[PDB]
Structures are given as C-alpha cells and as structure tokens.
Design an enzyme around this catalytic site. Sequence first.
Site, PDB file in Angstrom:
ATOM      1  N   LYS A 192       1.288  -1.092  -0.309  1.00  0.00           N
ATOM      2  CA  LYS A 192       0.212   0.037  -0.431  1.00  0.00           C
ATOM      3  C   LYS A 192       0.363   1.073   0.117  1.00  0.00           C
ATOM      4  CE  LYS A 192      -3.746   2.222   2.421  1.00  0.00           C
ATOM      5  NZ  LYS A 192      -4.359   1.985   3.678  1.00  0.00           N
ATOM      6  N   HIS A 210       2.402   6.088  -2.249  1.00  0.00           N
ATOM      7  CA  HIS A 210       4.075   6.930  -2.566  1.00  0.00           C
ATOM      8  C   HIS A 210       4.619   6.908  -3.316  1.00  0.00           C
ATOM      9  CE1 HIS A 210       1.437   8.396   0.872  1.00  0.00           C
ATOM     10  NE2 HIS A 210       1.386   7.043   1.781  1.00  0.00           N
ATOM     11  N   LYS A 266      -8.992  10.862  -2.551  1.00  0.00           N
ATOM     12  CA  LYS A 266      -7.893  10.900  -1.380  1.00  0.00           C
ATOM     13  C   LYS A 266      -7.833  12.379  -1.076  1.00  0.00           C
ATOM     14  CE  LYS A 266      -4.500   8.756   0.959  1.00  0.00           C
ATOM     15  NZ  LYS A 266      -3.132   9.080   1.046  1.00  0.00           N
ATOM     16  N   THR A 275       1.247  12.553  -0.937  1.00  0.00           N
ATOM     17  CA  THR A 275       2.543  12.578  -1.324  1.00  0.00           C
ATOM     18  C   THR A 275       3.682  11.201  -1.850  1.00  0.00           C
ATOM     19  OG1 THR A 275       3.029  14.015   0.493  1.00  0.00           O
ATOM     20  CG2 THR A 275       5.617  13.001   0.137  1.00  0.00           C
ATOM     21  N   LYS A 299       4.004  12.131  13.861  1.00  0.00           N
ATOM     22  CA  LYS A 299       3.395  12.574  14.488  1.00  0.00           C
ATOM     23  C   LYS A 299       2.812  12.153  15.420  1.00  0.00           C
ATOM     24  CE  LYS A 299       4.181  16.345  10.852  1.00  0.00           C
ATOM     25  NZ  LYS A 299       2.381  17.545   9.906  1.00  0.00           N
ATOM     26  N   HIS A 310       4.227   4.153   6.549  1.00  0.00           N
ATOM     27  CA  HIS A 310       3.556   4.570   6.002  1.00  0.00           C
ATOM     28  C   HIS A 310       4.195   6.312   5.906  1.00  0.00           C
ATOM     29  CE1 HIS A 310       0.656   2.866   9.388  1.00  0.00           C
ATOM     30  NE2 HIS A 310       0.237   2.907   8.317  1.00  0.00           N
ATOM     31  N   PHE A 311       3.684   7.202   5.550  1.00  0.00           N
ATOM     32  CA  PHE A 311       4.168   8.531   4.816  1.00  0.00           C
ATOM     33  C   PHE A 311       3.783   9.794   5.653  1.00  0.00           C
ATOM     34  CE2 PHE A 311       6.892  11.016   2.270  1.00  0.00           C
ATOM     35  CZ  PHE A 311       6.343  12.142   1.962  1.00  0.00           C
ATOM     36  N   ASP A 312       4.313   9.945   7.539  1.00  0.00           N
ATOM     37  CA  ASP A 312       4.128  10.941   7.759  1.00  0.00           C
ATOM     38  C   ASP A 312       4.222  12.198   7.860  1.00  0.00           C
ATOM     39  OD1 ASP A 312       3.117  10.533  10.756  1.00  0.00           O
ATOM     40  OD2 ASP A 312       5.251  11.763  11.089  1.00  0.00           O
TER      41      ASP A 312
HETATM   42 CL    CL Z   1       0.670  11.448   2.379  1.00  0.00          CL
END
Ligand code: CL
Lengths: 124, 124
Positions: B7, B12, B41, B45, B66, B119-121
């Site tokens: 995913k 990303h 969505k 990024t 975060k 995950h993209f933080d």
């Molecule tokens: Cl993002």
Amino acid sequence: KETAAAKFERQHMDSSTSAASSSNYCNQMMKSRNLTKDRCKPVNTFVHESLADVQAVCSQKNVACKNGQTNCYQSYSTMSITDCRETGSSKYPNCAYKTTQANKHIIVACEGNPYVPVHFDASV
Amino acid sequence: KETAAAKFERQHMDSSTSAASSSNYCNQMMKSRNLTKDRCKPVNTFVHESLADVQAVCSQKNVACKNGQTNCYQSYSTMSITDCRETGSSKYPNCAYKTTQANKHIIVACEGNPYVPVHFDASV
Ligand SMILES: [Cl-]
Ligand SMILES: [Cl-]
C-alpha cells in the site's frame, strides 16, 4: 481555557528569529513554549515569519487538510520554518529534540471571526 | 487484502519521473494509483526516488511520528517529492488536485521483516 487562536500562536509562531541558529533551538523552544510540561510533545513546527504573514495565509490557497476538512490554506510563498521532533534519547522529563530548519510552504487550518490559523497541518 | 508495504508503494512511490512536470501530475497520478476510486483521497505525497532509496530511510534518523509512535525515520538527504491536495473545485467523482513539487526530507513509519516503510508521515 486557551483559545484555539492563542494556542496556535504559542505552539507555532517564532517571529523573533529569521531561522534556527543551532541544533539546540528545539530543546529550548519546546520547553519555553510549555510543550514539555507534563510530557514531551512529539512533533512541532515553528514558523519564523511575522504573525501578520502567517494570519494572511487564511486568505491564500484553499486546499484539503490531511483529515479531509476543507478549511486549510497553503501559503503562496515559502516561509522559514523549524521542525522539532523527539529523538530516540528523548524521555520525559528529559525531552530531547532534533532541529530541522527549512524554507517551505505552510498549510494551516483556519477558523473563527476573525478568520485565523488554529492548526498547523503540514509544510510543503 | 493489500499488505501495508505494498500500500505504501502504491500510494507514495513514483520512481519513473525526476519531478512533477506539470500542474496536471496529481490529477493523473491520484487516478491511476486508484486513490480516487470511491472518493477523493484529500492529501497524498509521491516520492520521486528509487524504491531502494526510500526503503533505506528505515535505517536512517529515528524521529518521533506525529502520532507519538517511535518507528519513524527522517531521510538524511532531501528527496524530490510532489504533494497532491484537493482544491476547492474538487468534488467526487470529479476529483481535482493542486500539484506542489518540492525537495525535502521525508519522514516515514517503518514496520516488519524486512523493515520497510508503511506510512508517509510528513516532509521537512
Ligand atoms: Cl501523504
Ligand atoms: Cl506541528
């Protein structure tokens, strides 16, 4: 209770410097803005522009917020910012932060009358 | 069910271009990566570096996420990225995105064996 606008000012404004001058900036600012009182706030961005310039973003580019709300605005110009994030060595009450200075567009959520920043969403 | 690593790749990674070449990049990429299927969505990024370079971030600088988790990593170098965010004109099924290209450090959450981005933080 602190207003949302005042909380944004305290957490996210630092107009007294043009930029982070050293690696210790975040340790100092996180403490003094009372973001390490009962626990270490994990991540926090400070903006090195005038309060007026940051407030002005609320009438700039309307963009989606990460959470899906539509009250976010992206600054037309890049701004000097410092991201502060806890390091591995960080453990309350001895918080420890990495300081990363950058020049980036900011994205803030705006609310109220006057319509002013109440959350820092991201930088680009 | 799509794995978390897969995913992240789909959402990303865009290693086929050095950078966004036009304002229409996001409209095109959000559609083709299936991020506008049932709804738009809001924010996403894309990273314009090799998959290997992005995976390598999981052994770079450990920083807080975060959300307070401690499995985030900040890239030592800046990377070419494009932020895609819905505009005001955006309304499913006619999603519409602003494309903002930048060169910034990325922050990803990593998990698993192999220990890879899930995950993209944020970017800095
Ligand atoms: Cl993002
Ligand atoms: Cl922040």
